[PDB]
Amino acid sequence: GTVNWSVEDIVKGINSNNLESQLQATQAARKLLSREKQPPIDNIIRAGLIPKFVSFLGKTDCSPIQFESAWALTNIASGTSEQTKAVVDGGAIPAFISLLASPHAHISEQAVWALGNIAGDGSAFRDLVIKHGAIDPLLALLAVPDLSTLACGYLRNLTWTLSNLCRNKNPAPPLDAVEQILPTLVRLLHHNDPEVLADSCWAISYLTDGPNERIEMVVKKGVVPQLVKLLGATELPIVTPALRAIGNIVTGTDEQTQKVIDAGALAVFPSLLTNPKTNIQKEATWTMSNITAGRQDQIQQVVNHGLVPFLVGVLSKADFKTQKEAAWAITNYTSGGTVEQIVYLVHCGIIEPLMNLLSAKDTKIIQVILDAISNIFQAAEKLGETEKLSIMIEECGGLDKIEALQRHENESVYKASLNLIEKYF
């Protein structure tokens, strides 16, 4: 058949002046490149077959060789950046774009897949795929009244390729391309397929990771309520990118954060802040830290949703990275919060875990914790209860920690620790 061909036999078949022999050789190459173990990509490249595959992409009178060459090139473009670059150097991008409009659904799907791989290589190839005009036909493939009439795999492939066109930074995708893609991406974000939903959320997360103008571009399309709904999903592959997008959005202005809060996102954070997946807990605590860096009414919404005890919990027990995010959240809370809010924070039991974390071997967390202690002490000064707080910090073994920190290597650390010991102890 066409299984277990040698690269030499494939070369002899492709070099023949017989389109059908070329078809069989290209199919053998595809099967070689579809092997689960060590596909001979570099050997196929060294044989100089990529230009022949690219030429075959244009054989409209022989759709099987189009499909087989597209498959082979897709699998070559799936490897190292040098291999994808070899695919691009053979002129594959315009041929695949021209193939997007093929009347055969499987060929158009393979073209979508190949372009997805090429664009996913990096921002340069992504912008080159965009410059060749792939977005218009890609979106025309999804221009239907109901996405449910399209094949599941077809739709998943289109969504993943679009996500790759939204991915990567330095630079971020062209603004016009993002505006062109966003409407279709929102429609996909409202689709009922978990993989389509996950990849659409990943795309939204890419688009919201950057300057606040990108966040505004995304938020103006009204995706925040759907992002919150997906944040409440049961499938981790959906919650992860939804949480990423929500966090990114709350990295922006106070009004974007407020749009997140108004959609009811905080009501989901009791679960997120106790999620068994360490990454979910970490990113949820990072989101909470960015929310506590907001306005005082937003800190008050954090309080009203009963989330301060959950921050105390993650500060008490969690992965160290999550504990650092929690310390950041506490410091932002104390920096922006009212006196009543800081008192409430103390009443929930923050002092003991905050102190226990001062024994960490990470300078930054120690700094952050000391700024939080200074802010809480300022609130105490305003209420005239600095000695009460000093007693609370001593009884739990915190004074020992600060006195030991006085001899820390970092300069800011010992400065802050000494200042506390001199002002309050």
């Binding site: 579809s34 689960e36 596909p39 498959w71 897709t74 699998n75 473009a77 799936s78 490897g79 994808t84 393979q110 897949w113 997805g116 791989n117 996913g120 290589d121 993943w160 790759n164 991915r167």
Partner: peptide, 7 residues
């Protein structure tokens, strides 16, 4: 996943 192989 940045790139996917079709098998």
């Amino acid at each position: 996943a940045r790139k996917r192989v079709r098998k």
